[PDB]
């Protein structure tokens, strides 16, 4: 083996000993207080400009969320697409979350990106098993397949959509798997039938039944209530005594 002859063994070099390592303790939420006031300000401006649809807004750390009426979908996303201070020209993601304890089961979550302002915004609305939501493929061509997924996986129906068909599931599939009443292994299974010369569909049997270890969740709450971190600019002034 012909060694490079001016490339020495990097392992043969001795390293300077590291003694006592010290790291400060940081609270990562603390880095987000400097932008907490404007994120609240922007959400406050948004719901004054569209009082007809924006029910509330929340702020967690760097995330501002806007809560809207389902019928306000087209106006709100138009304002967030074509406003000069709201130049949010990407849909990053549209998905649903299921809350069977609500009268409107489905929360529709939109995540939007503004390359102009290096900013993100989340828009939430609600839907039901029968209550449809406006499609926004009139504003974002990229939102088309996302709504097919929400429909395919949840059953939510998007008025105005061209070609709202299943995107993920099999062709004659019945059910919406991301619903919380839908079982994990489904209701049907497939196999090849020698006597019928095709693949047939059967009721589900499992050689091993799925073992659900949810019951081992701590009898004690482990996170607690948290900490309130609202700007003083969005708290009500307190009445001074006397």
């Amino acid at each position: 083996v012909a060694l490079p002859k001016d490339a020495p063994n990097p392992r043969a070099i001795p390293r300077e000993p590291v003694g006592e390592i010290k790291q400060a303790l940081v609270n990562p939420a603390d880095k987000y207080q400097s932008k907490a006031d404007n994120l609240h300000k922007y959400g406050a401006w948004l719901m004054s400009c569209l009082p007809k649809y924006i029910q509330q807004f929340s702020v967690w750390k760097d995330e501002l969320t806007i809560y809207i009426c389902p019928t306000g979908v087209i106006p709100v996303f138009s304002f967030l697409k074509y406003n000069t201070n709201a130049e949010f020209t990407q849909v990053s993601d549209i998905t649903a979350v299921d809350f069977p304890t609500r009268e409107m089961r489905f929360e529709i979550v939109y995540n939007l990106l503004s390359v102009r302002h290096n900013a993100r915004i989340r828009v939430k609305t609600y839907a039901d098993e029968v209550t449809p939501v406006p499609s926004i493929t009139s504003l974002y061509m990229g939102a088309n397949w996302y709504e097919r997924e929400v429909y395919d996986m949840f059953g939510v129906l998007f008025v105005g959509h061209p070609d709202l068909r299943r995107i993920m599931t099999d062709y004659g599939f019945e059910g919406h798997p991301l619903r919380k009443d839908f079982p994990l292994t489904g209701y049907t299974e497939i196999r090849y039938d020698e006597e019928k010369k095709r693949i047939v569909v059967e009721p589900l049997e499992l050689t091993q039944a799925f073992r659900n270890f949810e019951g081992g969740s701590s009898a004690w709450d482990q996170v607690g209530p948290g900490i309130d971190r609202t700007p003083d600019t969005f708290k009500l002034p307190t009445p001074k005594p006397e």
């Binding site: 098993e129 029968v130 209550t131 449809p132 499609s135 059953g155 129906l157 998007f158 008025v159 105005g160 959509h161 061209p162 070609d163 709202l164 068909r165 299943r166 099999d170 062709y171 004659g172 497939i190 039938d193 006597e195 019928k196 095709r198 693949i199 047939v200 569909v201 059967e202």
Partner: protein
Amino acid sequence: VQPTKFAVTVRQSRNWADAKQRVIAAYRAWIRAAPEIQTMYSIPFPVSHIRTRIRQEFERHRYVNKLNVVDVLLQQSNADFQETMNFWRQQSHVMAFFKEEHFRGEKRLPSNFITGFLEGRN
């Protein structure tokens, strides 16, 4: 039908006169298509059995008196129509809609109390 051959833009029924018009047009297309479904999917049944079985699937929802419920039941039909008329569904999905091609057959619930008792709930 801009993106696909049988695509229909999702529409919300304006009233019961409109909603019944759409149901009848949905049923008409399906029973029209039954000869075309029986050759492509090589269904070993008469076109009459296919049509009478298509009728049953509309006969299930004949008593729906909610307009929001009809539109989802219409969208489900239109999507099923699109994936059957384009050869997207496999013969296995289509002739699995007929609930007699199970090796247990159509008779899969017990008929009465005693026959299901002697067989252990079927």
